[PDB]
Amino acid sequence: TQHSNKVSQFHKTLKNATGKKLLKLQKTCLKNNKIDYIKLLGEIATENQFEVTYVDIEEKTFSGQFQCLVQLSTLPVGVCHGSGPTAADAQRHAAQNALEYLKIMTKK
Amino acid sequence: TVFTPRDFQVELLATAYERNTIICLGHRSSKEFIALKLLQELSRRARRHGRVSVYLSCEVGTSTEPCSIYTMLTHLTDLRVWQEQPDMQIPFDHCWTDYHVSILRPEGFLYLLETRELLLSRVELIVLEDCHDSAVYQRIRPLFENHIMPAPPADRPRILGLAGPLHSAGCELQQLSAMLATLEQSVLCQIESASDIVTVLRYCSRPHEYIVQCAPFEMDELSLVLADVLNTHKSFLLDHRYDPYEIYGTDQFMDELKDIPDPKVDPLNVINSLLVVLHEMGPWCTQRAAHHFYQCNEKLKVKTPHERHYLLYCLVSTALIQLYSLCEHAFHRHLGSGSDSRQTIERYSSPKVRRLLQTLRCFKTLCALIYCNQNHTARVLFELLAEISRRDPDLKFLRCQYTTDRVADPTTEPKEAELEHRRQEEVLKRFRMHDCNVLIGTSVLEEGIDVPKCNLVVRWDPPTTYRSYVQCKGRARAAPAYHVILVASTTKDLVHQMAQYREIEQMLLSKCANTEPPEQEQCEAERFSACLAAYRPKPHLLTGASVDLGSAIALVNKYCARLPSDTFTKLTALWRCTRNERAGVTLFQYTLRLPINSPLKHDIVGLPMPTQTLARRLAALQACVELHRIGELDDQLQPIGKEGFRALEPDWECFELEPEDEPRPGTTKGAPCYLYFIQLTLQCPIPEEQNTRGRKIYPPEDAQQGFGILTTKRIPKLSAFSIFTRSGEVKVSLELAKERVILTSEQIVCINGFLNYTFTNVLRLQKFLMLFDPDSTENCVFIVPTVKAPAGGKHIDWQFLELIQANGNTMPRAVPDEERQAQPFDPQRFQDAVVMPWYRNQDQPQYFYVAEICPHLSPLSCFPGDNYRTFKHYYLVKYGLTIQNTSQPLLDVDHTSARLNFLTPRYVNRKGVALPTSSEETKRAKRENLEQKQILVPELCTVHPFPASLWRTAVCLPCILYRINGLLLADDIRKQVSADLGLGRQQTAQEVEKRQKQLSIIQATNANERQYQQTKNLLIGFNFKHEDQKEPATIRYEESIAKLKTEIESGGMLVPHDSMMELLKQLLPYVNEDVLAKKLGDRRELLLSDLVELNADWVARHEQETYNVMGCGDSFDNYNDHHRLNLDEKQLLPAGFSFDRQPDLVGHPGPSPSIILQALTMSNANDGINLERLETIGDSFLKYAITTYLYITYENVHEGKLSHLRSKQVANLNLYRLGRRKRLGEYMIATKFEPHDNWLPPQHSIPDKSIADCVEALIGAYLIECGPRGALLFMAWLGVRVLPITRQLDGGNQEQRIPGSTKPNAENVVTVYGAWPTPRSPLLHFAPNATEELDQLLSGFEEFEESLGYKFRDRSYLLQAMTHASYTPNRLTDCYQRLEFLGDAVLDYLITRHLYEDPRQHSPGALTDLRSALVNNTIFASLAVRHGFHKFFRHLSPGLNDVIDRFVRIQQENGHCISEEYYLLSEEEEVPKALGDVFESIAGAIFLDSNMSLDVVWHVYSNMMSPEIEQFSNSVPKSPIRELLELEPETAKFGKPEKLADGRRVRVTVDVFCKGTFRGIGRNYRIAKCTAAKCALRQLK
């Protein structure tokens, strides 16, 4: 029954931040392409005292589309991912999934 | 907590006895059980005609490890058994002639018959294992084709089959009906429905069956976004291409490329499960499920060693974090203040949940069991119901629990499998409290596990097996019961499913033998409920308890369920149906046998009657009448109990409490008097090797002065003993004084002054703080000194007596130097005198002895030491005292013993190394104070007048003054017992551990994992079909299902988702109306005797009746109503260790008071010998004193009532009450041996158990000398009447008084205690040829004759002792559990004496430990198996046979042995009881087959029980571990077992007061406790 306290602690912890980048994320329609998603994710990585770890896949799809994943080194850890036509696009959609996972997480 | 008991798995046995039958059960254990029981039950009929009993199976020959059935039947019942391993040559020598059961393959049976080795007429019973297979059908088809069917029914054996449970065989319904037809025509049998399902459906009523439809979920924002989240994670995980070649790329790890698991399959399980939970139950259910999956998946993160596995498991955990955040906001977006969340809860609940909730709303005694075929589904359903019960005020009245079918694998992780079992335990114990209601199970509660009545049963999953649907139906017992299946347009196929299973039910119940009464017969009973008179044993009581027709079957079922027994034996009534056709009217007639434990064993036959239910009500009414007639029912009509029964009333005299009973009581908290000479003749002097003092030996008879006894009371004759003083071994005898002298008063004053000087200053027994008077009526003992004559006589020495009168104050004082100037010297004066050093410490002087006269010793000689030159210088410097003369030689002195108890007539010289030569209370102190050896001066040592040799005679004898007060009480006990007797006259271990664990687990192999095999084949397999054809019978059910479909669609079942004279005339249409009007009269209610009179009139007017044998009633109703079928269904010896040595009755004095005074000695004093030497025989005699009496007085009452009689009469409270009546505690001494304090020659608080330990101890006094017999007379003196009592008048015999004679009454009635009656055989001859059955049953007992080594006279007590409590086919005798009841006390007494009478002479605590370690029920089972008592026993009860098969596997793969059993004894200072207890029961037979002769039992049992008891004797259980168990006020507490890291080792802690805590390791609890005690002893020396 410990992990109930763990999941509530993590929800309160990543709702306890005071970043304006999170508010800019929340109000903006995040289906927009104008925002620098990988760079903003690195900014929030430097902001909230952890490592964003971009790791590519070693195995392309049956459709030949590249896959990337993002490790959000919190306690517990977030894992997000993206699949894009390039490694840049796979990392872009992976950093995207990281940001709506935070927006899902930071919605108070 | 009541129900309706049947003989389930035993109707199968009955129907397996008459008719060719095929049985359908699930376990393979119950198939082997019913198979073994049927082979032994037909074995007697096989053995008389020398036939061959065959078990046909196809799981034979798979292992050289023995097959299960071969194991069962070779070493668990009577039969010598052969199994054919698949590649032996099948020897033809004696494998069927001198072997009863052959378990064969059907091709082996084909080889056996086609070679003409065996005749089918010599084949008794064949049971065909797993005949529901088509492949087994293919083997058994030519066996019936060539051999079985061409044999005539005159030449046929009995055919039984075993089948998988055909109510869910792997077949559509046309194959099912074709299968039932094909098997019932092929195997020549009848199919049988009866399983536990069929039992709870037959005699518990069927619930109302519903299908309830559920509306689909109406998806919204949150649900669709959750579906988007899960489909996103699913699309990414299926978008993976996983390849360990493309990740690891390790060519050298080909084994590890496949051993590394997929990182996807547990993400697949979690995400598929959350998908399904959303898809059906909803997003709230998905939320709680996802939270619980997060609980387990973070544990899987901790467990995970690899890298991509950790990546994907962290991804799954992140998804769960997400889903909790989405559902948490969307369920908290409704959570404003003043808002109830329950509307949103029910809203996001699917209408599957809402429909469940209105189903639960309809139940404002709720008992709801809810299935679901998934465990986390049960957790989330639990969580919904918990949140509902903690929020909904409508549904606030529930207490909900759950469970799982995920017992973990014990080969890896059993520690939480224990917690799984503990969880199920705590849930069920809260459930059956009658204070808790709602359960949410899984398929763990499907079969095997039994749950009480539970009215509302909701199946979540649509059933895919029959068993779950119908067993959920069966868990709904309490009518009105509601079996509701939920469904969310598959309603068509579910209605079709209930139609399929409904025809499966109606093809079950039609294929029974026994039937339930339909609603018509219920209505007929309801109509006729008042037309028959209410039978009352007390009809005068208006508000008395009544038994009508209607409640009589309930009361007979209660009588069968209130007689107590094992939980492995099932006891129930046995009615049968008999059809009699009279006067154009069909009549059903029920007979009614009560089982063999009840002593009504004659059949009760009913009267003919038009229907089933009315006839059954009448037959059970007859049973209630005759059972109250005998007395097996009481006046209040409940069945008898162990505490609700009282025996015959003059025996109840021992159970009224005492005035001291009305620190809990009963628990552990001038006269010529008699003269004799005390002859002390030295027989063996002390050896010079044992003469550690290095002095001369001083014999007692070298002087001519001795002593004598002068008493007014009689002195008995005793055998000669030997006092072992420091001088050696002295034989002590009493010479008969030829002279008897009249008393002289002043010479008695001389004697008394001499005794005062002796017991004050010589022997010093009379201490201060004292009063004493040696002149009283109670004893007149005068111990006097005499002088031996030169002619051999011993004349009285009045000279020394008057000398001691004038000098009874011989006291050295401050001797002046002038008298020691004048003091002379002579060797004869100190030749044999006592020397007295006067110069220091005069008030408490010490007296020393003369040892050697040395002419070379002088005070002028050199002092042995450089401290002083001479003895003069040494004495003068150290004390300032002057020795007058130094010319004389000096004296060698000897120091006295510092201990009175030097007599102890068996050993003091061997006991002399114990304590350093009387322990030196003063010798070591004085030799420390004087340093150099005591060479003393004759001038400083004056003469004591008591001679040295007379002093050495004086120290052997004394301290008898309380012993004379002690050995009068013992002789008084002898006096009253011979007064009321007639007899007598008035004038490595770690290697061992690993080997036994390996052997135990890997050689059991049929543990409770067989129920798990049933579990893993339970809902999954349900297979096997033969064929189907296109016959119209299939088309027949193609309307029947269809019309059943209409029934399901017309019953309201599917739910849309939005004249008493005519009463008697119908009662008796075959009895004419005129006679009924004659018998009516004013009597409005006809008694049963009236219908008996009508039947007696009618059988007198036609004498030819017809008969009928059908149904669940047995052919074991048998002889007393059948087996002749005559239409009468209307009414009715080594002398070494001899127990019967028996010294002659008249001519023996009785109890010699020596052993009485032994038994009058408390162990609180523990003066050498204590009462505990004989107390342990007393209790273990007194059982066999009482029980045989309490067996033979009440010879036909079931034994558990007698057990309460034993437990109240051999109580320590009971023996304490008896000793209160006899007052022995003041006659016994519980004070220490202190002459100062508690020595009163002419209060000792006693524990209440010790008084009991007193009383039975007295029994030992009579128990060698009289033999066993006369102590019973003492028991007859004691007030427990253990002999049959013959009341008489004054016979007046003149040769002798009769043994057993009592005191003359005031009305001159003479009471004679004759011995027990030579008993009646139990052969209650209701049957004409019961002796023919008595020798029919016991084929094969000549081996039981030779192996046991005893020949019986009449086998009546043996085949009582060969009858289990559930063994109803035998109808001569009772169960064996009356010869338990006497066999336990007989072998208890025999073994307790052979422990006591052993020449090695074990200690009292050793005697208790050797009782509780030499013998328990385990060694009874072990030597039972060694003597083949498995191979000779009879029993018909379920569960017991598989349990004791595992136990005898423990004996098998070990091969009998002593090792495992004495090992478990070593933890015992149990898997069966019954096979242990049989060695008691046969023992009771040889108690009364041989007419109460214990010698017969012992000489028979010796050559069989020798090496075990010499092994337990050579194991030496005589350790100080028992004094470490004692020496414990607070100083040896033992902690609880604490299991260590490996589990197979325990550490036991022992805490010791003010000395610390010690801990010991071991392979279990008990060896750890032993090692902890050994460590406590090793560190506590």
Curated annotation (Swiss-Prot), chain A:
Keywords: Cytoplasm, Repeat, RNA-binding, RNA-mediated gene silencing. The keyword Cytoplasm applies. One of its GO terms (biological process) is regulation of regulatory ncRNA processing. GO terms for cellular component: cytoplasm; cytosol; nucleus; RISC complex; RISC-loading complex. It is found in: Cytoplasm; Cytoplasm, Cytosol. Residues 36-104 form the DRBM domain. Its main location: cytoplasm. Residues 1-108 are annotated as: Necessary for interaction with Dcr-1. Disruption phenotype: Larval lethal and displays miRNA processing defects. Embryos do not develop past the first instar larvae stage. Most females contain ovaries with empty germaria accompanied by one or two terminal stage egg chambers. Accumulates pre-miRNAs and displays a reduction in mature miRNAs. The keyword Translocase does not apply. One of its GO terms (molecular function) is double-stranded RNA binding. Residues 35-106 are annotated as: Sufficent for binding to Dcr-1. RNA-binding DRBM domains 1 and 2 bind dsRNA while DRBM 3 binds Dcr-1. The RNA-binding DRBM 1 and 2 domains are able to bind dsRNA independently. The DRBM domains appears to bind to the RNA duplex and then slide along the siRNA helix to the ends of the siRNA. The DRBMs display a preference for binding to the more thermodynamically stable ends of the siRNA which is enhanced by interaction with Dcr-2. This suggests that the domains may also function to pre-orientate the guide strand prior to loading into the (AGO2)-containing RNA-induced silencing complex (siRISC). The name 'Loquacious' refers to the mutants being 'very talkative' as they display a loss of several types of gene silencing. Homodimer. This is Protein Loquacious.
UniProtKB/Swiss-Prot annotation, chain B:
The gene is Dcr-1. Endoribonuclease which functions in microRNA- (miRNA) gene silencing and, independently of its ribonuclease III activity, also acts in the short interfering RNA- (siRNA) gene silencing pathway. Cleaves hairpin precursor miRNAs (pre-miRNA) to generate mature miRNAs (miRNAs) that are between twenty-one to twenty-four nucleotides in length and function in RNA silencing and post-transcriptional regulation of gene expression. Residues 1-359, 369-479 are annotated as: Essential for miRNA substrate recognition. Residues 1516-1581 form the DRBM domain. Disruption phenotype: RNAi-mediated knockdown results in reduced cell and tissue size in larval wing imaginal discs and reduced adult wing size; cells show a delay in G1-S transition. Mg(2+) 1 binds at residues 1175, 1253, 1256. Residues 846-1581 are annotated as: Essential for production of mature miRNAs from pre-miRNAs. Also important for proper formation of the siRISC complex but is dispensable for biogenesis of siRNAs. ATP binds at residues 25-32. Residues 670-807 are annotated as: Platform domain. The helicase domain is essential for substrate discrimination. Probably identifies authentic miRNA substrates, by binding to the miRNA characteristic single-stranded terminal loop, checking the loop size, and measuring the distance between the terminal loop and the 3' overhanging (3'ovr) termini which is bound by the PAZ domain. Residues 365-488 form the Helicase C-terminal domain. Residues 1-488 are annotated as: Helicase domain. PANTHER family: DICER-RELATED (PTHR14950), ENDORIBONUCLEASE DICER (PTHR14950:SF37). Its main location: cytoplasm. InterPro entries: Dicer_dimer_sf, Dicer_dimerisation_dom, DICER_DSRM, Dicer_PBD, Dicer_platform, dsRBD_dom, Helicase_C-like, P-loop_NTPase. It comes from Drosophila melanogaster. It is found in: Cytoplasm; Cytoplasm, Cytosol. The keyword Repressor does not apply. This is Endoribonuclease Dcr-1. The keyword Membrane does not apply. Residues 1133-1267, 1341-1491 form the RNase III domain.
